[PDB]
C-alpha cells in the first residue's frame, strides 16, 4: 500500500480494482448480431427509450451488434455503463458509433454500429472478438486473481 495509509481497508480496495486486469469477455452474457437499417427505429422493444435519448457522424451501418451484460458481474468487480461506453468509444470514436443503456435499467445492453460510407456481417464477427479478447478495461495486463492480506 501507499506508505501514507498504514492499514486502510477502502484504500486497499481502490488499488486492487485499479490493478486487476479485466475485459468485456469477463462481463458480457451473450454477443448478438441483429439486422436493423433505420437508426431511429430499432426492431428490439427493449431498445426503444435509449434511442430517442442518445439523439440530440456521417453515414451509418445497417448492422447492429447487441451485447447482454450481467448485473452481478459489473457489481462484484466495480463497473458502470458510463465507463464501459466511453472505453469502447475511445478505441474507435470516428471509426464506430457506440450506444449504451442506462445503469438504472433492468436490462443492460450495448448497441454498436459501423460508420464507413454490403458484406459487413462476416467483417463484424472479427470486430466482436477484438472487443472481448483484446481491448483492456482495468489495470495492467498479465495480472490475474488479486487478493488483500492481513
Amino acid at each position: 500500500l501507499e506508505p501514507g495509509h498504514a492499514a486502510d481497508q477502502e484504500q486497499a480496495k481502490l488499488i486492487r480494482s485499479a490493478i486487476e486486469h479485466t475485459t468485456l469477455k469477463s462481463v458480457t452474457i451473450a454477443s448478438e448480431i441483429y439486422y436493423d437499417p433505420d437508426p431511429r427505429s430499432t426492431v428490439i422493444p427493449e431498445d426503444e427509450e435509449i434511442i430517442q435519448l442518445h439523439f440530440s457522424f456521417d453515414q451509418q451501418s445497417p448492422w447492429l451488434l447487441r451485447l447482454e451484460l450481467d448485473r452481478a458481474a459489473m457489481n462484484d468487480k466495480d463497473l458502470t455503463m458510463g465507463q464501459v461506453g466511453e472505453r469502447i468509444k475511445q478505441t474507435f470514436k470516428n471509426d464506430l458509433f457506440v450506444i449504451w443503456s442506462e445503469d438504472n435499467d433492468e436490462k443492460l445492453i450495448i448497441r454498436c454500429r459501423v460508420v464507413r460510407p454490403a458484406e459487413e456481417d462476416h467483417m463484424l464477427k472479427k470486430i466482436e472478438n477484438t472487443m472481448l479478447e483484446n481491448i483492456t478495461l482495468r489495470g495492467v495486463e498479465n495480472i490475474e486473481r488479486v487478493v488483500m492480506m492481513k
Binding site: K125, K126, E128, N129, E133
Partner: protein, 135 residues
C-alpha cells in the same frame, strides 16, 4: 486383429472465432470434415449436418459447424471431393482406395458401406463438440 496403428485424430482448430475442423493415413495434411462427407457421397450440407447435429433444435452446435462448411465450399460434387491429391502421378483412384481399406478399418473394409462409415465420423465430431461446449 488384421497390427495397423491406424488413428484419425479429428482436430478442432481455433480457441477466438476460427472453429475449423481431421488427419488421415497415409496423408501428411489435415482434411476439413465437409470434404470428407462429400467424398463419402454425402454432398448436401443439410444431410452432412444431420450426421453431426442429431437434435436440430439446439443451435450451439450449428454455430461451431457454420465455418467448417465455407472452408471447403469450393469442393461440392463427389468427383471434386475425391481428387484431393493425398500424396504426384496422373489422382482420384488413390484417395478412392484409401476410403475403402485404410479409412475406418473397423465395422467393414469392403466397399459399399459409405453410410455406415460416415455415421461413425458423424458421431466422432459430435463427441468433439460436446466437450467444446463443456457439456
Amino acid at each position: 486383429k488384421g497390427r495397423f496403428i491406424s488413428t484419425l485424430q479429428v482436430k478442432l482448430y481455433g480457441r477466438s472465432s476460427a472453429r475449423t475442423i481431421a488427419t488421415l493415413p497415409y496423408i501428411k495434411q489435415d482434411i476439413p470434415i465437409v470434404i470428407i462427407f462429400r467424398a463419402l457421397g454425402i454432398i448436401p450440407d443439410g444431410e452432412i449436418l444431420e450426421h453431426i447435429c442429431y437434435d436440430v433444435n439446439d443451435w450451439q452446435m450449428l454455430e461451431m459447424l457454420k465455418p467448417c462448411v465455407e472452408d471447403g465450399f469450393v469442393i461440392q460434387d463427389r468427383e471434386t471431393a475425391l481428387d484431393f491429391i493425398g500424396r504426384l502421378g496422373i489422382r482420384i483412384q488413390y484417395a478412392k482406395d484409401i476410403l475403402q481399406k485404410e479409412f475406418l478399418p473397423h465395422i467393414t473394409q469392403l466397399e459399399g458401406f459409405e453410410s455406415r462409415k460416415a455415421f461413425f465420423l458423424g458421431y466422432m465430431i459430435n463427441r468433439l463438440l460436446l466437450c467444446a461446449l463443456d457439456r
